[PDB]
Symmetry: D2
Subunit: 330 residues, 4 copies
């Protein structure tokens, strides 16, 4: 997975992510209303009544809704992404905390926090535990990003030493290694720019670029988390600023096209195809959630505030996996 | 620009391209009917009557329709793409030939040819001339690709030495240098694969990848024509085969996502933004033409055979530059 | 600069480094005998008596010899290397420590320590201070590597948070960033191997490498400290094991050939050439010190033990900057 | 193998090469005197009298001396390097030519040519034949480079279409593909320079290089022939001009250190180590021949003109594989 946030010229914060994985568990757009109640652990029936309604992509396959990303009615945005070989969870909670299953972190935070500081305060009351789930069969190795209405972003990483918080980050996150490593890695690529290099001579030979784009020489094109981070970060820096919410969604999806993974192009060590199942964006000020799918390029949108946020039940929207082609003539 | 063709499992041939440029002159989908007539040179009133109707993207700003790419009623597909520093044209026709403006080549070929052999045979009675056009102010440096209904592809390059023809190619083309150079460059990257490298040790340190995608190590991520050719070619090789026409369009657009250029990421030496204006695909068997735009992710389609192919006038369809977002609620 | 250690199959440990800089202050091979004495600070009179004799490259331009690298009579080896933007020193010593000038660290450690644990204990007794020196005009930003006769290596980095010690490392060190960063970066390159990739097809086209060496695709060739680290580490991994001390020296100099910088190839932002001034190797068991220079490919050697270890003066050997070409005929 | 020529400030031309191979057939420095005579073919009796004496590295294991590279008494320099998958030889000579074994081309040309013009005229008189030899057991795939005393260089490549000649080249040659391919590939890397990139911001984060060297971002560091060509060419361009013959040798060897392959680092698909067996340089004006070996960094020199050029027998000099270490103690 890959993710970033941007700010528009009309003072709106937007966040977007690709979800890259090897299977499509039954996933849909889920609106969780206020006071629905969300479990902390799947093997215990302790429930936190959530203050806030929120909308995002997720699964209803276990006891409480598992949100992969989303935005709440107070403009807080966030996502869980993979963090293989780095994520570390405890067997028992630390003194003064309750255990939480890593897959309920987004649902719990979007249900209960407004600012990135709220999020940091909230997570001190919990210890992530090594609790499995039936969709995957194991606890996935995860890390977490949040962006609030102000545009401030944070990264939360369950490292071997404990929870590592990174404040006021560049608003880009992919997978392993840790955020500091990628932030440092950025420095090796500062020569990657939009501008062409000057012509040179070798002897009596004039040498000029083949066409355009030679300013990017040195940027990698593979789909490793470190390469994905570089592409999302550099193209976030150089893509034109979005003037409004629509341009924000459009631009986010253009930046993420450089990390969109076709089926077959990346295989796991077991030969499973790891691909971009969907791409989503969300806006803190409007509380609109947008998505497109591997099989459908047409962006769909769900407005959180359009619904009865005191509903008794979840409100869900199913994926349309048919390429939604506008016929201009028969 | 970047382009490729694929074959589906149900025996269809499709071809697609991105159009990368610094300005958007009035462009639209054009159907040219049979017996419309296409000029050879913009300054002379000699026309060739076209045997075949065709559809594609182009301009109606000069005397005859200028098609950037398209498919004809007999399944022939093709496109003109940039070829800077290589394209060479003459001031006067070679003896035995007529001159032709480089921008009229796709129109003439789609109007009169069925097979890739037909195209090769057809281009021998013409010399490309350095005639300007009002759309750009100069003759753009171009080379040409064609794929016929059988899936065979050719590249035609106006080199300093004369027209260079490559037959039965890999069905990928971007910009400069010439096709043999890119086909040779492929060999340097055969280690770019979907599969992860094996873990190693250094002393007592075990070293494993950060996540997935490390089989791609070495593939460049910049937008030079050589890097674009590599990415299209390798992702064409490893993306899952399309089962049908709709999977074809979807897969073509996923492979081209890797060479989709966001505005601001590539600047020319004049400071102009070079970005992916549209992405199109077309199918030899159905004669359907499909496109999406920088500002509009939803794919539209025009069927050539749905129209009156003996119509007197061009039939056109205008771009919809609004992001066509499906609203799932209210 | 770049550095590594290796172990031979006859149980010897060797260490080598390049010295890359923009000018050559008066440098030479220095033997410091036992009980000679070394200052901790230029501005204070305290002289620490050294228990052990040592040899290495260094300067005699300040009060006590400054060794850039070397080996002592107990087989402890070490070197100081650049650490730009990371090294940070204090104005005053911490409670219960003595201040030390960064450039006197190698002289103090070689003079008084045998194992890497000894080095770690010795350093707790000191605080590195921001004291300048006359050779450069400022306190240079440095980090340190040591390798004892057992072949265990450590890295000591004066970070913003305090002294960071890395134990039992891979025995490679260049410049910034920190050792943990580079050791993590190794993981992105585990696909760099001696073995060629298998042939592939694209359609009917068979693709095979140009020659040999394609297993290394992905490895960077520039002279940045991260690129230098990767090349030293991967080439350390795959270069044939040395069977004796002479092969050990030979192999070290071959591995470092991949990070040997010709004059003019790397300029600072003032346009000064940063080049490899010398390359040195040393062996814990023999106490031999070997070196070649930019202008002289012939390796020269100095034996520590051959000299009077109780000498009452330094013993120095001057550089021969003339290419030492053996004339095979008149 | 890798090769280049340079011109000194004092107007001397020098040429150098590495020899990279998987085995070391008995090789030495050979002076071939005038009128010694060189076979064209092993299976036919004709010996061609050589007008000129020459010196270089080679083999005496077959009928006539086989020189791998060398310089003649009129200042012509040249070498044969590998050209896998591209070299194409005939079964019979073309009408009007004599057949020649590919391994005898250097001896015949050095024995009889002065200028690159002469070399071209000479090669038009031959057809390279698919004749084997008892050193390898097969006709090795080869291509050839020559530099005359004026400093003009040519490349001669036995392609499938016939001999291809490239005149006044940049004075760099490695292995496959053909010279025009590599010369075009140089254009993709014109952004590889000695100078650092400017610092950038990302949000509030200031990004600066780790150290020095970041102008080189993009240059590959693997040992394939295309990567070796880029490193030799770019470092020939930016390495300071050699002021005299001795600096010329030193600089050539520094440039070639970037393509010096340690044993173990490159294996063939038959698991053989391909490594740099020797590195040689030669000077057209002095007719001095210089070399170092994998196991001995000290350069030896042979002067052609010092010998009796009308001697009846070869004059040879054996390799000294012992690392020739200057012992400084006394
Ligand atoms: Cl281009
Ligand atoms: Cl990943
Ligand atoms: Cl090779
Ligand atoms: Cl550095």
């Amino acid at each position: 997975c890959s993710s970033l946030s941007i700010r528009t010229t009309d003072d709106k914060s937007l966040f977007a992510r690709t979800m890259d994985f090897t299977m499509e568990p039954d996933s849909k757009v889920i609106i969780v209303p206020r006071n629905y109640g969300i479990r902390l652990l799947e093997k215990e029936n302790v429930v936190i009544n959530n203050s806030y309604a929120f909308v995002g992509m997720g699964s209803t396959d276990i006891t409480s809704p598992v949100l992969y990303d989303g935005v709440n009615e107070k403009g807080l945005m966030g996502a869980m992404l993979y963090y293989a070989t780095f994520a570390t969870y405890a067997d028992e909670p630390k003194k003064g905390t309750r255990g939480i299953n890593p897959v309920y972190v987004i649902s719990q935070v979007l249900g209960n926090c407004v600012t990135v500081d709220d999020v940091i305060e909230k997570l001190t009351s919990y210890t992530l535990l090594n609790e499995a789930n039936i969709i995957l069969g194991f606890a996935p190795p995860l890390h977490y990003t949040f962006t609030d209405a102000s545009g401030e972003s944070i990264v939360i990483e369950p490292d071997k030493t404990g929870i590592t918080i990174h404040r006021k980050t560049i608003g880009v996150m992919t997978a392993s290694p840790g955020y500091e490593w990628h932030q440092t890695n950025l420095r090796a690529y500062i020569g990657v720019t939009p501008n062409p290099p000057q012509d040179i001579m070798m002897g009596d030979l004039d040498l000029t670029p083949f066409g355009q784009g030679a300013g990017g020489l040195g940027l990698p094109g593979d789909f490793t988390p470190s390469a994905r981070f570089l592409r999302v970060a550099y193209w976030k820096k150089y893509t034109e600023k979005a003037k409004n919410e629509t341009e924000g969604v459009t631009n986010l999806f253009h930046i993420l096209s450089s990390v969109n993974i076709p089926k077959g192009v990346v295989l796991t060590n077991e030969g499973k195809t790891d691909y971009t199942i969907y791409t989503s964006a969300m806006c803190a000020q409007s509380k609109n959630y947008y998505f497109k799918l591997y099989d459908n390029s047409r962006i769909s949108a769900v407005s959180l505030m359009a619904e009865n946020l005191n509903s008794q039940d979840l409100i869900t929207f199913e994926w349309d996996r048919k390429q939604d082609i506008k016929q201009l003539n028969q």
